[PDB]
Amino acid sequence: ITIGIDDAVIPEEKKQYLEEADRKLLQIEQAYEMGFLTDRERYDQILQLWTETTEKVTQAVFKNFEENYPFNPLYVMAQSGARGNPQQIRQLCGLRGLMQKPSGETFEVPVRSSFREGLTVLEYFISSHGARKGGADTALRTADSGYLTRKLVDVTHE
Amino acid sequence: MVQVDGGRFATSDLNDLYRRLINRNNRLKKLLAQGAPEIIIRNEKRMLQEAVDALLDNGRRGAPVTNPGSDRPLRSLTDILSGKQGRFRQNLLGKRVDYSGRSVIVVGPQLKLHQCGLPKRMALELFKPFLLKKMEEKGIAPNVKAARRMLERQRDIKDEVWDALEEVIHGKVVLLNRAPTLHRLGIQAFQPVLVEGQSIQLHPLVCEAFNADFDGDQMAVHVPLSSFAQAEARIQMLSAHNLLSPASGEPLAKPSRDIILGL
Amino acid sequence: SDPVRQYLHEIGQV
Amino acid sequence: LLMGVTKSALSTKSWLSAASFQNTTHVLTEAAIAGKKDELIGLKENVILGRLIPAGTGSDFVRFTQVVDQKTLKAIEEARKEA
Amino acid sequence: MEIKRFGRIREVIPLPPLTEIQVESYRRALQADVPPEKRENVGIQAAFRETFPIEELVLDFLEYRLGEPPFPQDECREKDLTYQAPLYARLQLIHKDTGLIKEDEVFLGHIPLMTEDGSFIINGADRVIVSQIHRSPGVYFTPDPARPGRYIASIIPLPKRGPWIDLEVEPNGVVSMKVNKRKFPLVLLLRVLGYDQETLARELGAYGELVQGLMDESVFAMRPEEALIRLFTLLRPGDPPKRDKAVAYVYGLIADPRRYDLGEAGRYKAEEKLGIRLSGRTLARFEDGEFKDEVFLPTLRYLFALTAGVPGHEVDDIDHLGNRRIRTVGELMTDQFRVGLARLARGVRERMLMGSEDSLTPAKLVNSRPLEAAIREFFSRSQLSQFKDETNPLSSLRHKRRISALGPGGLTRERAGFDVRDVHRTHYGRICPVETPEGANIGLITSLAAYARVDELGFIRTPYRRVVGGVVTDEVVYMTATEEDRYTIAQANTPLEGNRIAAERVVARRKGEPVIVSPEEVEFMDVSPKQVFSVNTNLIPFLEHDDANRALMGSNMQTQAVPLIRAQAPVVMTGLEERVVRDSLAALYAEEDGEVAKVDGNRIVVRYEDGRLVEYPLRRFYRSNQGTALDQRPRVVVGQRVRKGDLLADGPASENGFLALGQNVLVAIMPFDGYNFEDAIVISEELLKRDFYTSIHIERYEIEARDTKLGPERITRDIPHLSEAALRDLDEEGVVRIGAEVKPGDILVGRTSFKGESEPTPEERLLRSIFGEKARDVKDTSLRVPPGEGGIVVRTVRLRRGDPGVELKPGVREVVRVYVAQKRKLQVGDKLANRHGNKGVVAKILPVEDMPHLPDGTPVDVILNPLGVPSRMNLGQILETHLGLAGYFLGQRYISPIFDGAKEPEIKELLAQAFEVYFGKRKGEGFGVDKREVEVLRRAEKLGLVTPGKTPEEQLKELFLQGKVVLYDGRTGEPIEGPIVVGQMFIMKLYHMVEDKMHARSTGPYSLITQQPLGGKAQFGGQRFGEMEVWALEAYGAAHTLQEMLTLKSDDIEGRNAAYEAIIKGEDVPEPSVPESFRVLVKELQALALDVQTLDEKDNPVDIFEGLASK
Amino acid sequence: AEPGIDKLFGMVDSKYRLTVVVAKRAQQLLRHGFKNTVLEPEERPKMQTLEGLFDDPNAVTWAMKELLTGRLVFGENLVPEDRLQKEMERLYPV
Amino acid sequence: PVSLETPIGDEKDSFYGDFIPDEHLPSPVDAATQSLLSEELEKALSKLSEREAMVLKLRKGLIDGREHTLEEVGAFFGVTRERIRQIENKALRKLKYHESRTRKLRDFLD
Amino acid sequence: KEVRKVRIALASPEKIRSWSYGEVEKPETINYRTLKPERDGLFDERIFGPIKDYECACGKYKRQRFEGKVCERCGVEVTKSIVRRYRMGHIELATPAAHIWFVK
Amino acid sequence: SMARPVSIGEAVGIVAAQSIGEPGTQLTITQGLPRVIEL
DNA sequence: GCATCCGTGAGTCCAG
DNA sequence: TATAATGGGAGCTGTCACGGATGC
Ligand SMILES: [Mg+2]
Ligand SMILES: [Zn+2]
């Protein structure tokens, strides 16, 4: 068992799904500029399209693995439960996916790259928002967890 | 009121609070004896009440009394009893303890589930009194005092004291703990195996219950002393005697990581 | 609430 | 009456436990007024006192159990049979 | 060796001086190189000009000057002195009535000086003043959290200069002002300022419903004097409304520039937000006897216009980096200087009343102790003044560029929510989104971007190239965030042919929003990707292939690398490793062209073009703050021709001017018998054999012999009851000789202390009688070596009393410092890491023969477990390994820039060039393929790695181009059943080593009040058995072990004494007793007048004090 | 896992009672110098030194083995405490 | 004097007084040493006769904490002061011979 | 006897005085030259106890043969120094003061 | 932990509190640990 | 009955 | 031990969310 960069297998369905998503995004933009749907509905449709596309490329990664590379190290580690879960493998092989602003509002533009391909500096900076938000969330959550544990210990100790 | 190493003096804030109280009380007694007007006596009694308040619970009412040239409030009795640093939480429900150690942990694949790797020198200091008694039983030292004076210098340590220490720890177990201790499996008892080097060796299967890994974690060691403490550790707290989680019931020590991968 | 202010007020009454 | 964990912990009958949890001055003032006696029922009470907790090997159920070998057992049996 | 660099991005400008945020700040603050008449009103000059004249006799400030340092830096570090310069101030005392002038230059004490690298030396310890981010002063408008259609106007001055003012429209309609927690109608303050109902009705009348709420008839009925008295009664109840007192208070609150200071930045921001011009840095003025408004009416007008919905009025993002500014060393030091100066001025005003009102000089009036105390406080005990992190040069260089949101005048940890810790869209190019502490301080401590620099107003600026039409100029414009929000800024990697944009659609940012835009819409362009990240983050190759959470650790751990004796620069560099060695002064360079005259281990002598012969002394084996050795090795030879800026000596952790934080080792990525289970690491004993990861560490020990009321402490070789073997390595005076090895227990400095008066126990009387030897008057107090420490004595320093040049603190006869150095080899428990966040402890050091090895016999060095890669999503290390394999066989290093680097096809090309060397050498040597290589090729084409049917060589090349090789198990000889990634990786030995952290205690020191053991390894303390460990013991049901923790193993005196004696006698441990800390609790409750009674089952009192406290 | 720990848990209605029994018996063995033991010379727990097999110094090991044999009688109110102590000090002096 | 509660560090978790050991109360090692010293002294004193060991216990104050003069110990045992000084000398001499033979009390000389 | 309960109650001034071994009349701590506790101050050996075991202040009684004896010259009882962790003093207020806990 | 009837004297409340608290740091469209504390 | 103020909490161990 | 002197001075701000008293 080893890991080389070639073990992050980009599936051939990715370019197809991405081109389909671009044509759908253009269809939604054309439906917006004609005043049929509002800015809110357009934003929601774009997010939903990219979410379903992300799930599609996940399934494509794992299907290409199962059928054409059943002993691929990433696939083996994920399936056996040794290490890894589908979303991490997706970020390695499929697309990174949607990111969110510091406000929590999700960006319209997803990160189309994978860690095998490499991100753009702009994609990286967009990712940093969520990474920092999660770090601060954890750092503030451990205190509430510990406090709660001590409350429970003091109420149940006898 | 104590003298530190450098001959300087260190004192408690209660002394300054008591001094304030005694000064204002004596001055009130003198002001009453001299029959001072009511405004002066009133101010003095108000300051006396303020001083009693600052002694019992400083900062509770009004501004906290501080030492000269400092913004740090003085530490009253209430501040002593209450709080995370208070007497209860810091010295009563938890204590620093003797016969304990701490070191960096390392994977111990060769260990059995009931074992852990314990550095020699850690065990030498942790079991030091048992080792002195055993060095007295064997001919290594005339008495306890000579044995301790022999262990005091590292170059005076010969190779029979190590075999004596092996005889000492036989059958006994030590407690390994890793902070934070979230559930009762953050402390577990292991039979120690003396190892060269300065690292604690931890069995892989118990890494999950400790949430331990080898990115630089450290663990604390404790030595149960009495035969009662040893019985409790060996029967109840032994790592191989707790295989299931008390929270769910599912196995806690289970094949994982590299193990699952190979199988 | 402020002992100095209160004592100054007591003083200013004479 | 339903109350959350904090208020229920502060309401416990043992004032040593309650004072060692939170609001130490409030607990201690009401307890000192009431003349409260702590019966040392739970764990925190006995841990503060440095006593042997009433659980596990300290439980009154298992605490007084004795061990004796059949040789000494029968020896004392015959010693008490002759009195 | 060949260094092949990648990337097509051309940086039009180099990185700024990396320590300039410290250097230029302090330089502008002190103005010591400016002749006093040409000094601007800033820094120390501004502090003096603000404090003076002292009006009450009138004492006035003319000028100041700074002298030369009484001692050089090395002397300061040696003697525990502060590197500082004497500050003199020329003041003239003028009697306004007499006309008499008495003018004098008074000495105000010493001001600490910044060294070349941007640090300070305080009491011999190197320290760094960390910049502090905070809200910029000014006028902000934020949505009222209660009422959605209403807003709050905040007027915020500089910290510790005046109060915050809150303007709010209450539900009842009247406008309210909040100052010092007190609220009142703003109409009253407007009436004090001279406004009348006419001026307000015309100025604000455009907005109908609000001005009617503003109107208060009784306020306009009374003239400004009555409104002033009324406002003084509203603000200060109980204080008699004396009109002079009211003018004084309102002036000192709003209009006094001495008590109320908006920033110069705050002034500019108010002028820019409200569209007005400020005559000064105050909210109003006292002119011609009355009050004249400056700020209030424009802010009220903006508030009303924002409430009505008038276009052009916006709420303010308070986390925008245009509303958040940095206070650097100069500003904070100037603040503390200003405080000390104001206290000195209070002392002066107090002196201008007492004594003789006629005979007074500026020397008699000024007391500098307040100023000396304030500066001493700021530098010694402040939170922003930190012990310098100089583990390696990068540690300090990054330390100086730290940005703290904490400290005095800033956030506490509970005051900081998500908004502060967040990465703002304006951190792009200014504050690094990666490098931040991991833990509770995340988002508070941050680091400065690479191309970023802080301007004179305190806002961080980033450079951008101007783009006119489709042509990208080479001129760079440094913008703040607010100015950046105006333009459309394309990305630095956008295609270019010449200076013209070569793409039909470019990626750009409008207010941080990413957008696809035509080259005609492009107003500016990024300088380089480097500008988005910090310096440490820029040292991570293939950073675009690493998840941010692991890149954070890579950055933060490069700070922790230990300088190694054979340290080398990585095979895959980013291009910043040379400039980092340059800007922090680790390495020594040539000032001008010339020829090398002399090369020693101790100095390098260069003869320049000028003909002058310059000698550079080399720092050799000097202990840093953290114990890592600082030492410069000469890299030139006698007679060598050098140019300007050429390297002369390599500093610590550098190789030929490149930053060398670790070593390049041959790594294989595979499981190995569980010895790399869960991030542990397996290493080859060959690493110890060739002294890789071996580092030098020096520890300083110190001892004082002082005067006692019982007699002198003497440092002597004569020590009671000690063998000659124990005193072997001590000289005549008692200090250890240089060069002698010391082990735990050995004596460094012998010392005798007179025993305290003690009546000998009758046992000692009979014992003394038996042996006939008298009891000595002194006692052994010698300084020994702590457990687990030791090494070679490399230096000793002795300082006596009465010898020239030295004076100790009162009572101290002599002080001896012993320096002990050690060569630490790598060992089990030491922590390694790479630049990608892969970190772990060494768990197994195997002999070379067990090590997995290449078919040609080459064993690998490190074995990393692949299971750490997929969860962590840091693939950059994989690419580093591939390129490192190629560079291992081609014998060359690389420069792969961040976000514009070596991409996969080029790495494949280099891998093929490498495979030719790897295999054609074998084929020419007369060797074919191995049988086991055929078996591995079989199992590999079963994996789909190689195409079936090709020759063995072609398939081995197909594997090599994937970075995988055939690997033989040294234990069996049988190969690993699959092809394995092997290549060269850069790995660093971090500062966390088992020798430092291992600790054990049986019994030892106890604390005074609680009688519990101490804590810390240095105090031989015990481990803390906290609340949660007690929970664990209770949940296990182990009552007796818990009772041991509570009583025998701590805090029970009788119990622990009896326990130790029982154990050394072989007896079982006794029943525990009452904990001493419970007795402390009982007595401390009695001190609170609460009676605590321990009762038995008959409710009868039980005495746990055993009759000692009962009469 | 301690030898036969499953059978040892089978013997008792509560594991903590087993712990108490083991600890009290180990104190008995330590006090009387192991010469009150119920083990036959071939059942004695051994320990490998550099010299050879010697008797296991660990009284807890001894106690658990003795418990496995079945020759020990445990329970509550089997004998007054002073009578037990004195009869054991008569059978096995110190 | 300086305050024992002087904060160490930028957190509120440590006080100066927490780094100051207690030098007054004897450590468990010291108490063990003193107890073993008393036990070895009584072991070596039982090698004498009860009368001469008693003269030594009265002379050096191991009984009652007071050191009795020769006239008092002689008036206690009925003998003359020179007789009690002589039996004290012979008891000390037998003790010195026992000590040179056994070497048990040397380690307590520190 | 074995402790089975713990009671907490208010303390009368009589109980406070029955705990007290003496009144602290002077704010002084220890002498600036001899470094010994000042009389009637916060560290007075006459109130709280002896600094060294079984030894009075001036050194007239230095062993356990006198225990419970109070030295006539210096006023110190000869007992174990540990009692300085136990024995309480008191202060007689000229005017009654409210215990802030029962007010605030 | 033993898949058998609990032994009399087991400190159940502490085990319960630890069992509830230990996964707390993992609780993350979802209300999560704030909801746990609300309850 | 509903605002508004005051007071009290806000994870563990290590190392400095 | 005697000219006359007669009301202070420093503040310090970016939580947050409960419980429980005290204000219309
Ligand atoms: Mg870890
Ligand atoms: Zn006396």
From TrEMBL, chain G:
Main location: cytoplasm
A GO CC annotation given for this chain: cytoplasm
Domain of life of the organism encoding this protein: Bacteria
GO MF annotation terms: DNA binding; metal ion binding; sigma factor activity
Keywords, alphabetical: Cytoplasm, DNA-binding, Metal-binding, Sigma factor, Transcription, Transcription regulation
Gene Ontology BP annotations: DNA-templated transcription initiation
Binding positions (Mg(2+) 9): D10
Residue ranges the UniProt entry marks as DNA-binding: 70-89
Chain positions recorded as Mg(2+) 10 binding sites: D13
Subcellular location: Cytoplasm
Subunit note: Interacts transiently with the RNA polymerase catalytic core.
Function: Sigma factors are initiation factors that promote the attachment of RNA polymerase to specific initiation sites and are then released. This sigma factor is the primary sigma factor during exponential growth.
Protein name in the entry: RNA polymerase sigma factor SigA
Organism, as annotated: Thermus thermophilus (strain ATCC 27634 / DSM 579 / HB8)
